[PDB]
Amino acid sequence: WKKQAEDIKKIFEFKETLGTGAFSEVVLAEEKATGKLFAVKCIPKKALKGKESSIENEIAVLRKIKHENIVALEDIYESPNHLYLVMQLVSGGELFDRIVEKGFYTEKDASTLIRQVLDAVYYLHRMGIVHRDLKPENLLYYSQDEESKIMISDFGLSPGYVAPEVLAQKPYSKAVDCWSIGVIAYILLCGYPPFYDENDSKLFEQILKAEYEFDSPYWDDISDSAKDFIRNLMEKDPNKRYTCEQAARHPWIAGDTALNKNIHESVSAQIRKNFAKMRKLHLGSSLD
Numbered sequence: 001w002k003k004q005a006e007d008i009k010k011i012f013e014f015k016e017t018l019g020t021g022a023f024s025e026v027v028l029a030e031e032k033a034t035g036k037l038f039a040v041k042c043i044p045k046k047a048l049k050g051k052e053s054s055i056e057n058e059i060a061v062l063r064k065i066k067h068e069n070i071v072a073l074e075d076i077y078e079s080p081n082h083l084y085l086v087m088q089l090v091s092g093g094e095l096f097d098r099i100v101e102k103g104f105y106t107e108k109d110a111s112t113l114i115r116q117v118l119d120a121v122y123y124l125h126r127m128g129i130v131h132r133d134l135k136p137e138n139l140l141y142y143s144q145d146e147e148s149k150i151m152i153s154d155f156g157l158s159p160g161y162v163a164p165e166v167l168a169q170k171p172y173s174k175a176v177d178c179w180s181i182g183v184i185a186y187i188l189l190c191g192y193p194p195f196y197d198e199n200d201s202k203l204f205e206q207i208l209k210a211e212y213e214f215d216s217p218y219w220d221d222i223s224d225s226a227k228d229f230i231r232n233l234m235e236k237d238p239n240k241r242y243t244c245e246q247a248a249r250h251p252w253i254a255g256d257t258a259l260n261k262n263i264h265e266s267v268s269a270q271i272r273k274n275f276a277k278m279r280k281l282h283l284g285s286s287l288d
């Protein structure tokens with residue numbers, strides 16, 4: 001390792017808050033010496049009182065990992081009261097915004113997104129890292145290009161997306177990441193979270209018992225292969241739950257069972273209900 005700074009503000013100009021959690025905040029910051037922009041995760045040291053050593057081991061591994069679909073941890077700074085994770089800035093745009101504005105959106109688009117997420121988390125699991133906070137807001141596009149890759153853009157060093165065994169207060173595993181990927185896939189195909197209720201206590205019971213359905217009519221035009229894929233990831237028993245490597249082989253990801261039907265109308269309509277907000281000329285540039 002951690003670089004030392006008496007005043008982190010001598011190194012970075014903090015410009016814009018990007019997200020605030022219970023124990024950290026990510027801020028868009030400019031390296032004063034270079035003008036380069038980064039996403040700096042600011043962590044108060046008091047929040048890490050229970051197990052500083054495990055966080056130190058995790059960040060040390062994160063510094064060495066490198067993956068297409070994972071933000072790079074470029075540096076670690078330390079002040080008397082804070083830890084600063086200097087992350088690569090992903091400015092391509094948010095996942096749900098992109099889908100709403102698309103106009104044409106299919107299972108193949110959703111499968112392409114999940115395929116990248118599966119590969120990134122599989123790699124993380126191979127390196128001994130459990131992400132623990134996989135959710136749509138942590139997925140950002142690398143660039144504005146329509147074919148841009150998606151990127152896991154934040155880390156969960158510390159209820160709708162969390163696995164039942166976590167709610168049961170059972171010990172975490174890599175399997176909790178796989179459950180979360182299944183929840184992301186569910187939302188990508190219908191636009192609403194699999195578990196909801198006005199009463200928080202009844203919502204807890206529904207997640208704990210894994211009570212969800214592929215509700216009509218929203219799922220009527222979704223392929224059976226996609227539902228089978230989600231079922232194996234959103235499996236209550238972690239002993240029976242798909243691994244990332246298993247899910248990557250499923251025909252919905254690795255094969256051709258993902259449909260090309262335009263589901264944008266229903267999916268974007270549900271997203272708005274649940275989440276608050278190259279041109280080529282024929283025989284000219286088309287011949288590339």
Ligand SMILES: NC(=O)c1cnc(N2CCC[C@H](N)C2)nc1Nc1cccc(C(F)(F)F)c1
Pocket residue numbers: 018019026028039071087088089090091092137138140153154
């Ligand atoms: N790795 C990152 O670049 C990055 C990390 N964390 C975050 N969040 C915000 C979403 C929630 C998450 N737990 C922390 N958002 C990032 N970036 C981001 C977000 C919005 C807008 C822009 C900007 F390009 F317009 F500036 C960048």
